[PDB]
Design an enzyme around this catalytic site. Structure first.
Site, PDB file in Angstrom:
ATOM      1  N   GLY A  57      -6.290 -22.544  25.912  1.00 42.60           N
ATOM      2  CA  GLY A  57      -6.607 -21.721  24.751  1.00 42.60           C
ATOM      3  C   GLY A  57      -5.513 -21.724  23.704  1.00 42.60           C
TER       4      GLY A  57
ATOM      5  N   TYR B 248       8.415 -20.782  27.021  1.00 39.44           N
ATOM      6  CA  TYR B 248       9.299 -21.943  26.909  1.00 39.44           C
ATOM      7  C   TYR B 248      10.715 -21.610  27.411  1.00 39.44           C
ATOM      8  CZ  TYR B 248       5.519 -23.878  24.095  1.00 39.44           C
ATOM      9  OH  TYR B 248       4.287 -24.328  23.697  1.00 39.44           O
TER      10      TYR B 248
ATOM     11  N   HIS C 260       6.232 -31.777  13.511  1.00 40.02           N
ATOM     12  CA  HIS C 260       4.785 -31.528  13.608  1.00 40.02           C
ATOM     13  C   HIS C 260       4.333 -30.298  12.817  1.00 40.02           C
ATOM     14  CE1 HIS C 260       6.234 -28.556  16.493  1.00 40.02           C
ATOM     15  NE2 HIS C 260       5.041 -27.962  16.462  1.00 40.02           N
TER      16      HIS C 260
ATOM     17  N   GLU D 237       0.968 -27.309  13.179  1.00 36.99           N
ATOM     18  CA  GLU D 237       0.187 -26.777  14.297  1.00 36.99           C
ATOM     19  C   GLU D 237      -1.182 -27.471  14.422  1.00 36.99           C
ATOM     20  OE1 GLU D 237       1.656 -24.435  16.588  1.00 36.99           O
ATOM     21  OE2 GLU D 237       3.283 -25.223  15.339  1.00 36.99           O
TER      22      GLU D 237
ATOM     23  N   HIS E  10       7.753 -28.634  11.018  1.00 39.36           N
ATOM     24  CA  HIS E  10       8.981 -28.118  11.653  1.00 39.36           C
ATOM     25  C   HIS E  10       9.426 -28.953  12.866  1.00 39.36           C
ATOM     26  CE1 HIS E  10       5.506 -25.929  13.155  1.00 39.36           C
ATOM     27  NE2 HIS E  10       6.130 -25.735  14.323  1.00 39.36           N
TER      28      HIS E  10
ATOM     29  N   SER F 192       5.164 -17.945  22.477  1.00 38.68           N
ATOM     30  CA  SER F 192       4.414 -18.319  21.281  1.00 38.68           C
ATOM     31  C   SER F 192       2.903 -18.384  21.469  1.00 38.68           C
ATOM     32  CB  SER F 192       4.943 -19.635  20.705  1.00 38.68           C
ATOM     33  OG  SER F 192       4.587 -20.738  21.521  1.00 38.68           O
TER      34      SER F 192
HETATM   35  C1  LIG Z   1      -0.553 -26.900  24.536  1.00 37.71           C
HETATM   36  N1  LIG Z   1       0.568 -26.626  23.632  1.00 37.71           N
HETATM   37  C2  LIG Z   1       0.094 -25.987  22.404  1.00 37.71           C
HETATM   38  C3  LIG Z   1       1.262 -25.607  21.506  1.00 37.71           C
HETATM   39  C4  LIG Z   1       2.060 -26.858  21.138  1.00 37.71           C
HETATM   40  C5  LIG Z   1       3.204 -26.557  20.206  1.00 37.71           C
HETATM   41  C6  LIG Z   1       3.080 -26.345  18.826  1.00 37.71           C
HETATM   42  N2  LIG Z   1       4.225 -26.040  18.244  1.00 37.71           N
HETATM   43  N3  LIG Z   1       5.129 -26.047  19.264  1.00 37.71           N
HETATM   44  C7  LIG Z   1       6.469 -25.668  19.010  1.00 37.71           C
HETATM   45  N4  LIG Z   1       6.662 -25.169  17.787  1.00 37.71           N
HETATM   46  C8  LIG Z   1       7.802 -24.518  17.542  1.00 37.71           C
HETATM   47  C9  LIG Z   1       8.795 -24.329  18.473  1.00 37.71           C
HETATM   48  C10 LIG Z   1       8.615 -24.898  19.727  1.00 37.71           C
HETATM   49  C11 LIG Z   1       9.664 -24.797  20.736  1.00 37.71           C
HETATM   50  O1  LIG Z   1      10.644 -24.075  20.617  1.00 37.71           O
HETATM   51  N5  LIG Z   1       9.438 -25.482  21.856  1.00 37.71           N
HETATM   52  C12 LIG Z   1       8.312 -26.193  22.067  1.00 37.71           C
HETATM   53  N6  LIG Z   1       7.311 -26.285  21.229  1.00 37.71           N
HETATM   54  C13 LIG Z   1       7.457 -25.623  20.036  1.00 37.71           C
HETATM   55  C14 LIG Z   1       4.555 -26.365  20.442  1.00 37.71           C
HETATM   56  C15 LIG Z   1       2.486 -27.586  22.414  1.00 37.71           C
HETATM   57  C16 LIG Z   1       1.263 -27.866  23.282  1.00 37.71           C
HETATM   58 ZN   LIG Z   2       5.030 -25.709  16.441  1.00 38.17          ZN
END
Ligand SMILES: CN1CCC(c2cnn(-c3nccc4c(=O)[nH]cnc34)c2)CC1
Ligand SMILES: [Zn+2]
Ligand SMILES: [Cl-]
Ligand SMILES: [Zn+2]
Length: 341
Positions: free
Chosen positions: A159, A166, A177, A179, A265, A277
Protein backbone atom coordinates in the site's frame (compact mmCIF):
# COMPACT_ATOMS: atom_id res chain seq x y z
CA UNK A 1 5.99 33.97 -3.23
CA UNK A 2 9.45 32.23 -2.81
CA UNK A 3 10.76 33.36 -6.29
CA UNK A 4 14.24 31.89 -5.43
CA UNK A 5 12.65 28.36 -4.97
CA UNK A 6 14.84 27.76 -1.82
CA UNK A 7 14.07 25.15 0.94
CA UNK A 8 11.87 26.78 3.64
CA UNK A 9 11.62 25.79 7.39
CA UNK A 10 8.41 26.15 9.52
CA UNK A 11 7.83 26.30 13.32
CA UNK A 12 4.02 25.81 13.89
CA UNK A 13 2.39 26.39 17.34
CA UNK A 14 0.34 23.55 18.96
CA UNK A 15 -2.92 25.08 17.54
CA UNK A 16 -1.53 25.42 13.93
CA UNK A 17 -0.01 21.86 14.07
CA UNK A 18 -3.25 19.99 15.07
CA UNK A 19 -4.78 20.13 11.51
CA UNK A 20 -2.32 18.33 9.08
CA UNK A 21 -4.10 19.09 5.72
CA UNK A 22 -4.78 22.75 6.63
CA UNK A 23 -1.09 23.23 7.58
CA UNK A 24 0.02 21.69 4.20
CA UNK A 25 -2.22 24.27 2.39
CA UNK A 26 -0.68 27.07 4.56
CA UNK A 27 2.98 26.26 3.65
CA UNK A 28 1.95 26.20 -0.09
CA UNK A 29 0.37 29.69 0.34
CA UNK A 30 3.92 30.80 1.47
CA UNK A 31 5.55 29.20 -1.64
CA UNK A 32 7.20 26.16 0.08
CA UNK A 33 6.24 23.78 -2.83
CA UNK A 34 8.52 25.68 -5.31
CA UNK A 35 11.70 24.08 -3.77
CA UNK A 36 10.05 20.60 -3.94
CA UNK A 37 11.10 19.92 -0.31
CA UNK A 38 10.28 21.65 3.06
CA UNK A 39 11.15 21.24 6.80
CA UNK A 40 8.55 21.31 9.65
CA UNK A 41 9.81 21.52 13.27
CA UNK A 42 6.92 20.40 15.58
CA UNK A 43 6.28 22.09 19.02
CA UNK A 44 8.74 20.83 21.74
CA UNK A 45 5.84 19.47 23.88
CA UNK A 46 4.62 17.06 21.10
CA UNK A 47 5.99 13.47 21.10
CA UNK A 48 4.73 10.53 18.90
CA UNK A 49 6.17 7.94 21.39
CA UNK A 50 7.25 8.20 25.09
CA UNK A 51 10.39 5.99 24.71
CA UNK A 52 12.52 4.09 22.13
CA UNK A 53 13.88 1.48 24.67
CA UNK A 54 11.25 -1.18 23.69
CA UNK A 55 11.96 -1.82 19.94
CA UNK A 56 14.96 -4.28 20.09
CA UNK A 57 12.64 -7.27 19.19
CA UNK A 58 11.29 -5.57 15.97
CA UNK A 59 12.15 -7.58 12.82
CA UNK A 60 13.67 -6.14 9.59
CA UNK A 61 12.49 -8.93 7.17
CA UNK A 62 14.57 -7.90 4.08
CA UNK A 63 17.86 -5.99 4.84
CA UNK A 64 19.68 -4.73 1.71
CA UNK A 65 23.45 -4.55 1.09
CA UNK A 66 24.07 -1.43 -1.12
CA UNK A 67 26.76 -2.01 -3.78
CA UNK A 68 27.84 1.14 -5.66
CA UNK A 69 29.63 1.33 -9.07
CA UNK A 70 31.04 4.44 -10.77
CA UNK A 71 33.39 7.45 -10.89
CA UNK A 72 33.60 11.27 -11.51
CA UNK A 73 30.33 11.94 -9.59
CA UNK A 74 28.27 9.38 -11.67
CA UNK A 75 27.18 6.11 -9.92
CA UNK A 76 24.80 3.11 -10.12
CA UNK A 77 23.56 1.39 -6.94
CA UNK A 78 22.73 -2.37 -6.83
CA UNK A 79 20.82 -4.17 -4.04
CA UNK A 80 21.66 -7.57 -2.52
CA UNK A 81 18.94 -8.93 -0.16
CA UNK A 82 20.40 -10.46 3.06
CA UNK A 83 18.69 -12.66 5.76
CA UNK A 84 16.13 -11.25 8.29
CA UNK A 85 17.46 -9.55 11.46
CA UNK A 86 16.24 -7.70 14.58
CA UNK A 87 16.85 -3.94 15.35
CA UNK A 88 19.19 -5.18 18.18
CA UNK A 89 21.37 -7.13 15.67
CA UNK A 90 21.23 -4.22 13.17
CA UNK A 91 22.32 -1.65 15.85
CA UNK A 92 25.34 -3.89 16.84
CA UNK A 93 26.61 -3.98 13.17
CA UNK A 94 25.80 -0.22 12.57
CA UNK A 95 27.91 0.87 15.63
CA UNK A 96 30.79 -1.67 15.04
CA UNK A 97 34.37 -0.57 14.01
CA UNK A 98 33.77 -1.83 10.42
CA UNK A 99 30.60 0.29 9.70
CA UNK A 100 30.56 3.26 12.21
CA UNK A 101 30.69 6.98 11.15
CA UNK A 102 34.25 8.45 10.64
CA UNK A 103 35.59 11.31 12.87
CA UNK A 104 34.66 14.82 11.55
CA UNK A 105 34.36 18.54 12.58
CA UNK A 106 32.13 20.25 9.90
CA UNK A 107 29.25 18.84 7.73
CA UNK A 108 31.23 19.72 4.52
CA UNK A 109 33.96 17.30 5.76
CA UNK A 110 31.46 14.39 6.20
CA UNK A 111 29.83 15.16 2.76
CA UNK A 112 33.34 14.89 1.11
CA UNK A 113 34.00 11.57 2.95
CA UNK A 114 30.62 10.24 1.61
CA UNK A 115 31.28 11.15 -2.10
CA UNK A 116 34.90 9.83 -1.88
CA UNK A 117 34.04 6.45 -0.16
CA UNK A 118 30.51 5.40 -1.35
CA UNK A 119 31.96 2.56 -3.63
CA UNK A 120 34.03 0.95 -0.78
CA UNK A 121 32.91 -1.32 2.17
CA UNK A 122 29.19 -1.74 1.07
CA UNK A 123 26.79 -0.90 3.98
CA UNK A 124 23.46 -2.54 5.08
CA UNK A 125 20.13 -0.57 4.91
CA UNK A 126 17.14 -1.80 6.98
CA UNK A 127 14.73 -0.35 4.40
CA UNK A 128 10.96 -0.65 3.54
CA UNK A 129 9.88 -2.40 6.80
CA UNK A 130 6.03 -2.37 7.02
CA UNK A 131 5.17 -0.75 10.40
CA UNK A 132 4.88 2.30 12.71
CA UNK A 133 6.58 3.71 15.87
CA UNK A 134 3.60 6.05 16.76
CA UNK A 135 1.50 5.15 19.85
CA UNK A 136 -2.25 4.37 19.21
CA UNK A 137 -3.57 7.60 20.89
CA UNK A 138 -1.50 10.10 18.74
CA UNK A 139 -3.94 12.13 16.54
CA UNK A 140 -1.51 14.86 15.30
CA UNK A 141 0.51 14.14 12.08
CA UNK A 142 0.00 10.34 12.47
CA UNK A 143 1.77 8.85 9.35
CA UNK A 144 -0.23 5.57 9.74
CA UNK A 145 -3.58 7.44 9.22
CA UNK A 146 -3.31 10.94 7.60
CA UNK A 147 -6.87 10.60 6.06
CA UNK A 148 -6.20 12.66 2.83
CA UNK A 149 -8.08 12.15 -0.54
CA UNK A 150 -5.40 9.44 -1.34
CA UNK A 151 -7.75 7.10 0.70
CA UNK A 152 -10.20 7.15 -2.32
CA UNK A 153 -7.89 4.50 -3.99
CA UNK A 154 -8.12 2.38 -0.74
CA UNK A 155 -11.97 2.61 -0.76
CA UNK A 156 -12.69 -0.12 -3.43
CA UNK A 157 -10.29 1.07 -6.26
CA UNK A 158 1.79 -3.27 -0.85
CA UNK A 159 0.00 0.00 0.00
CA UNK A 160 1.10 3.54 -0.96
CA UNK A 161 -1.18 4.78 1.87
CA UNK A 162 0.51 2.57 4.58
CA UNK A 163 3.58 3.42 6.83
CA UNK A 164 7.23 2.29 6.23
CA UNK A 165 10.24 2.20 8.59
CA UNK A 166 13.88 2.82 7.56
CA UNK A 167 16.79 1.73 9.81
CA UNK A 168 19.94 3.51 8.64
CA UNK A 169 23.72 3.32 9.13
CA UNK A 170 26.61 5.47 7.88
CA UNK A 171 26.81 5.79 4.04
CA UNK A 172 23.34 4.18 3.28
CA UNK A 173 21.68 6.12 0.42
CA UNK A 174 18.56 6.95 -1.53
CA UNK A 175 18.97 7.64 -5.28
CA UNK A 176 17.53 10.50 -7.37
CA UNK A 177 13.70 10.08 -7.81
CA UNK A 178 10.16 11.59 -7.60
CA UNK A 179 7.40 9.67 -5.72
CA UNK A 180 5.23 6.89 -7.30
CA UNK A 181 2.49 8.64 -9.43
CA UNK A 182 4.30 12.03 -8.62
CA UNK A 183 2.60 12.07 -5.13
CA UNK A 184 3.66 13.98 -1.94
CA UNK A 185 5.58 12.24 0.84
CA UNK A 186 6.12 12.72 4.58
CA UNK A 187 9.27 11.61 6.51
CA UNK A 188 9.78 11.78 10.31
CA UNK A 189 13.23 11.17 11.89
CA UNK A 190 12.34 9.27 15.16
CA UNK A 191 15.82 9.04 16.75
CA UNK A 192 19.55 8.79 15.98
CA UNK A 193 22.17 10.38 13.68
CA UNK A 194 21.14 12.94 10.94
CA UNK A 195 19.89 12.41 7.31
CA UNK A 196 21.13 14.80 4.54
CA UNK A 197 18.99 15.62 1.46
CA UNK A 198 19.49 17.13 -2.04
CA UNK A 199 16.55 18.60 -4.03
CA UNK A 200 15.80 19.96 -7.55
CA UNK A 201 12.86 22.47 -7.87
CA UNK A 202 9.82 20.97 -9.81
CA UNK A 203 10.02 23.85 -12.36
CA UNK A 204 13.56 22.50 -13.24
CA UNK A 205 12.90 18.68 -13.06
CA UNK A 206 13.01 18.14 -16.89
CA UNK A 207 16.57 19.61 -16.90
CA UNK A 208 17.74 16.87 -14.46
CA UNK A 209 16.01 14.21 -16.70
CA UNK A 210 17.85 15.50 -19.81
CA UNK A 211 21.23 15.44 -18.03
CA UNK A 212 20.60 11.83 -16.70
CA UNK A 213 19.48 10.59 -20.19
CA UNK A 214 22.68 11.99 -21.76
CA UNK A 215 24.80 10.17 -19.08
CA UNK A 216 22.92 6.79 -19.31
CA UNK A 217 21.67 6.41 -22.97
CA UNK A 218 21.32 2.58 -22.75
CA UNK A 219 19.06 2.79 -19.64
CA UNK A 220 16.80 5.45 -21.35
CA UNK A 221 16.32 3.33 -24.53
CA UNK A 222 15.19 0.30 -22.40
CA UNK A 223 12.83 2.39 -20.15
CA UNK A 224 11.55 5.98 -20.54
CA UNK A 225 11.18 6.55 -16.74
CA UNK A 226 14.51 4.74 -15.72
CA UNK A 227 15.01 7.11 -12.71
CA UNK A 228 11.94 5.33 -11.15
CA UNK A 229 14.22 2.20 -10.71
CA UNK A 230 15.95 4.30 -7.91
CA UNK A 231 19.52 3.24 -8.88
CA UNK A 232 21.03 6.56 -10.19
CA UNK A 233 23.42 8.62 -7.95
CA UNK A 234 24.64 12.10 -9.15
CA UNK A 235 26.88 14.26 -6.93
CA UNK A 236 26.11 17.99 -6.21
CA UNK A 237 29.42 18.93 -7.96
CA UNK A 238 28.24 17.22 -11.21
CA UNK A 239 24.92 19.25 -11.07
CA UNK A 240 26.89 22.56 -10.49
CA UNK A 241 29.28 21.72 -13.42
CA UNK A 242 26.20 21.55 -15.76
CA UNK A 243 24.25 24.48 -14.22
CA UNK A 244 21.37 22.43 -12.75
CA UNK A 245 19.70 24.42 -9.88
CA UNK A 246 19.56 22.56 -6.53
CA UNK A 247 19.48 22.97 -2.74
CA UNK A 248 20.59 20.96 0.31
CA UNK A 249 19.34 20.44 3.89
CA UNK A 250 20.27 18.27 6.91
CA UNK A 251 17.35 16.67 8.88
CA UNK A 252 17.86 16.01 12.63
CA UNK A 253 15.95 13.75 15.11
CA UNK A 254 12.45 15.03 15.92
CA UNK A 255 11.99 16.81 12.51
CA UNK A 256 9.59 16.29 9.55
CA UNK A 257 10.55 16.61 5.80
CA UNK A 258 7.79 17.17 3.14
CA UNK A 259 8.36 16.24 -0.57
CA UNK A 260 6.01 17.80 -3.12
CA UNK A 261 4.62 16.51 -6.50
CA UNK A 262 7.37 16.24 -9.20
CA UNK A 263 10.13 17.16 -6.65
CA UNK A 264 13.36 15.17 -7.39
CA UNK A 265 15.33 14.24 -4.20
CA UNK A 266 18.43 12.12 -3.15
CA UNK A 267 20.51 11.75 0.03
CA UNK A 268 22.34 9.76 2.71
CA UNK A 269 22.40 8.71 6.44
CA UNK A 270 25.16 9.95 8.86
CA UNK A 271 24.86 6.85 11.06
CA UNK A 272 22.42 4.67 13.05
CA UNK A 273 18.89 6.18 12.97
CA UNK A 274 15.18 5.43 12.24
CA UNK A 275 12.75 7.25 9.89
CA UNK A 276 9.01 6.68 9.16
CA UNK A 277 7.31 7.58 5.85
CA UNK A 278 4.17 7.34 3.62
CA UNK A 279 2.63 9.06 0.55
CA UNK A 280 -0.33 11.49 0.70
CA UNK A 281 -2.38 13.69 -1.69
CA UNK A 282 -4.06 17.14 -2.05
CA UNK A 283 -6.48 18.40 -4.76
CA UNK A 284 -3.45 19.93 -6.69
CA UNK A 285 -1.89 16.38 -7.10
CA UNK A 286 -4.79 15.03 -9.35
CA UNK A 287 -3.37 16.77 -12.53
CA UNK A 288 0.20 15.48 -11.63
CA UNK A 289 -1.18 11.88 -11.33
CA UNK A 290 -2.96 12.16 -14.73
CA UNK A 291 0.30 13.35 -16.44
CA UNK A 292 2.94 11.21 -14.54
CA UNK A 293 5.45 9.37 -16.90
CA UNK A 294 5.56 5.69 -15.72
CA UNK A 295 8.10 2.79 -15.85
CA UNK A 296 7.51 0.55 -18.93
CA UNK A 297 10.11 -2.29 -18.65
CA UNK A 298 8.63 -3.76 -15.39
CA UNK A 299 4.83 -5.08 -11.84
CA UNK A 300 5.49 -1.31 -11.19
CA UNK A 301 3.17 0.91 -9.00
CA UNK A 302 0.24 2.21 -11.14
CA UNK A 303 -2.82 3.97 -9.62
CA UNK A 304 -6.00 4.33 -11.76
CA UNK A 305 -6.87 8.09 -11.91
CA UNK A 306 -10.50 7.38 -13.07
CA UNK A 307 -12.02 7.58 -9.48
CA UNK A 308 -10.37 11.07 -8.94
CA UNK A 309 -11.52 12.56 -12.32
CA UNK A 310 -15.20 11.51 -11.69
CA UNK A 311 -15.33 13.05 -8.17
CA UNK A 312 -13.21 16.23 -8.60
CA UNK A 313 -13.41 16.94 -12.41
CA UNK A 314 -16.87 15.59 -13.67
CA UNK A 315 -17.06 18.28 -16.44
CA UNK A 316 -13.71 17.01 -17.97
CA UNK A 317 -14.42 13.23 -17.61
CA UNK A 318 -15.55 12.65 -21.27
CA UNK A 319 -12.67 14.79 -22.68
CA UNK A 320 -10.14 12.94 -20.41
CA UNK A 321 -11.29 9.41 -21.44
CA UNK A 322 -11.00 10.40 -25.17
CA UNK A 323 -7.41 11.58 -24.41
CA UNK A 324 -8.24 15.21 -25.41
CA UNK A 325 -7.44 16.81 -21.95
CA UNK A 326 -4.44 19.08 -22.79
CA UNK A 327 -4.06 20.96 -19.43
CA UNK A 328 -0.56 22.44 -18.82
CA UNK A 329 0.73 22.26 -15.22
CA UNK A 330 2.03 25.53 -13.67
CA UNK A 331 4.41 24.27 -10.85
CA UNK A 332 4.37 27.74 -9.09
CA UNK A 333 0.58 27.73 -8.29
CA UNK A 334 -0.51 26.71 -4.72
CA UNK A 335 -3.25 24.08 -3.92
CA UNK A 336 -6.92 25.40 -4.05
CA UNK A 337 -7.25 24.63 -0.25
CA UNK A 338 -4.74 27.55 0.37
CA UNK A 339 -7.44 30.11 -0.77
CA UNK A 340 -8.24 31.15 2.88
CA UNK A 341 -4.56 32.28 3.36
C1 LIG B 1 7.80 0.28 -1.60
N1 LIG B 1 8.53 1.52 -1.30
C2 LIG B 1 7.68 2.68 -1.55
C3 LIG B 1 8.40 3.97 -1.15
C4 LIG B 1 9.69 4.11 -1.96
C5 LIG B 1 10.42 5.39 -1.64
C6 LIG B 1 10.07 6.66 -2.14
N2 LIG B 1 10.84 7.62 -1.67
N3 LIG B 1 11.71 6.99 -0.84
C7 LIG B 1 12.63 7.75 -0.08
N4 LIG B 1 12.42 9.06 -0.15
C8 LIG B 1 13.03 9.85 0.75
C9 LIG B 1 13.87 9.38 1.73
C10 LIG B 1 14.13 8.02 1.76
C11 LIG B 1 15.07 7.47 2.73
O1 LIG B 1 15.52 8.11 3.67
N5 LIG B 1 15.34 6.17 2.59
C12 LIG B 1 14.76 5.40 1.65
N6 LIG B 1 13.88 5.81 0.78
C13 LIG B 1 13.55 7.15 0.83
C14 LIG B 1 11.49 5.66 -0.81
C15 LIG B 1 10.54 2.86 -1.78
C16 LIG B 1 9.73 1.62 -2.14
ZN1 LIG C 1 11.18 9.59 -1.86
CL1 LIG D 1 17.62 2.82 20.33
ZN1 LIG E 1 11.44 0.68 -16.15
Amino acid sequence: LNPSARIMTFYPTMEEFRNFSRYIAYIESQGAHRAGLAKVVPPKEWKPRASYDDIDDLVIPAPIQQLVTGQSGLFTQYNIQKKAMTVREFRKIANSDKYCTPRYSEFEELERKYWKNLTFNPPIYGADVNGTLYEKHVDEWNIGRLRTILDLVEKESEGVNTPYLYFGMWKTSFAWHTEDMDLYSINYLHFGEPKSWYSVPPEHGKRLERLAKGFFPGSAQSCEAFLRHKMTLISPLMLKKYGIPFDKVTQEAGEFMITFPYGYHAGFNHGFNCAESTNFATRRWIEYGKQAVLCSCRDMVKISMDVFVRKFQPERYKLWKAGKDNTVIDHTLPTPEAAEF
